[PDB]
A = this chain, B = another copy of it.
């Protein structure tokens, strides 16, 4: 049916699997280069042979059009998609006196109560982020992240240029530019970074009164990740047509390396025996128009009917 693109690309990775020792080696099957397109006029690509929580996706984009850098705005939206990159600077200097959490992702997975003592200082931290307007300001500004690279390309002669606002005055002044590309890749401070831009850039497009958006994703976690991304940018495509007043068209997801972590192989097999349902229709608050200035109540998903949620070994 409609989500069929996504679902094929676990088939080819099985049947083309290059087995890479990468990670801490740990195990992966990859491929290199893949495009896979989606008709956004058909229905909205939320995955129906798995249950993908639409809340945490928009809670994260609305982090992104708000130009926002701060763990505090996602937390107070129950969003726990980003914690550990700013809990990486809790295990970092002073105030941090006497738990460890030294490169903790690892020993929590290979834990019993370690994951839990990490789960309790981490929690201490999260609720600081919530309540004191200065510690929060400190550990919480992640600085180079999308909200910033979207809404403030930082220049030499230290200005901030917002790629997103300019490219959509360009879709409003000039429909046909082959130059509506926003790029999250800054080579200067790419090697001073922790996680370089996964979504490297996105080109947009106006064909027949209607708009598309194309994505070069430099690395992708096929199971434990991609279902989410399909929606994050297929919802984006939907909200900037809402500001330019055009129609919706195609989300092209194009890939560089796409892999399937080998710890997950049983689990991707199963939902590939699932049979698709129809896919929901996303509809945005009509009367309001700046996507940049949207809250939560401004996107409702309707008739979404997932299969049960398949559990992580994380990624």
Chain A residues engaging chain B, CB cutoff 8 angstroms: 18, 20, 22, 30, 32-35, 37, 153-158, 161, 163, 166, 176, 178-179, 181-183, 185, 187-188, 190-191, 196, 200-201, 203, 205, 207-208, 212, 214, 216, 218-219, 250, 252, 254, 256-257
Interface centre among A191, A207, A208 (most CB of B within 10 A): A207
- A20 close to B219 (CB less than 8 A): no
Given contacts A182-B187, A201-B216, A218-B181, contact A207 B30 (CB under 8 A): yes
Given contacts A35-B35, A153-B187, contact A178 B257 (CB under 8 A): yes
Q: Which residues in B have their C-beta under 8 angstroms from that of A178?
A: 218-219, 256-257
Q: Which residues in B have their C-beta under 8 angstroms from that of A18?
A: 207-208
Interface centre among A22, A191, A257 (most CB of B within 10 A): A257
A-B contact pairs, 15 of them (CB 8 A): A18-B208, A20-B176, A33-B250, A156-B156, A166-B191, A178-B219, A178-B257, A179-B218, A181-B185, A181-B200, A181-B218, A183-B200, A201-B201, A203-B257, A216-B254
- Give the distance to chain B from A202, nearest Cβ to Cβ, in Å: 9
A32 to B249, CA, bound (A): 11
- A33 close to B158 (CB less than 8 A): no
Q: Which residues in B have their C-beta under 8 angstroms from that of A214?
A: 32-33, 256
A166 to B109, CA, bound (A): 34
A203 to B256, CA, bound (A): 7
- Give the distance to chain B from A94, nearest Cβ to Cβ, in Å: 28
- B153 close to A155 (CB less than 8 A): no
Instruction: Apart from A163-B187, A183-B187, list 11 A-B contacts with CB within 8 A.
Output: A33-B254, A34-B35, A154-B156, A156-B156, A156-B158, A161-B187, A179-B219, A183-B185, A185-B185, A205-B256, A214-B256
Closest 10 CB pairs of A and B: A156-B156, A178-B219, A33-B252, A203-B256, A35-B35, A183-B185, A155-B188, A18-B207, A22-B176, A178-B257
- B32 close to A205 (CB less than 8 A): yes
A157 to B166, CA, bound (A): 25
A212 to B188, CA, bound (A): 24
Q: Which residues in B have their C-beta under 8 angstroms from that of A212?
A: 32-33
**Nearest B residue to A167 by beta-carbon distance?**
B187
- B153 close to A188 (CB less than 8 A): yes
- B218 close to A196 (CB less than 8 A): no
Q: Which residues in B have their C-beta under 8 angstroms from that of A155?
A: 156, 188
A178 to B20, CA, bound (A): 12
- Give the distance to chain B from A28, nearest Cβ to Cβ, in Å: 9
**Nearest B residue to A195 by beta-carbon distance?**
B179
**Nearest B residue to A211 by beta-carbon distance?**
B32
A157 to B157, CA, bound (A): 9
User: A183 touches which one: B166, B176, B183, B256 (CB < 8 A)?
Assistant: B183
- Give the distance to chain B from A285, nearest Cβ to Cβ, in Å: 28
Q: Which residues in B have their C-beta under 8 angstroms from that of A34?
A: 35
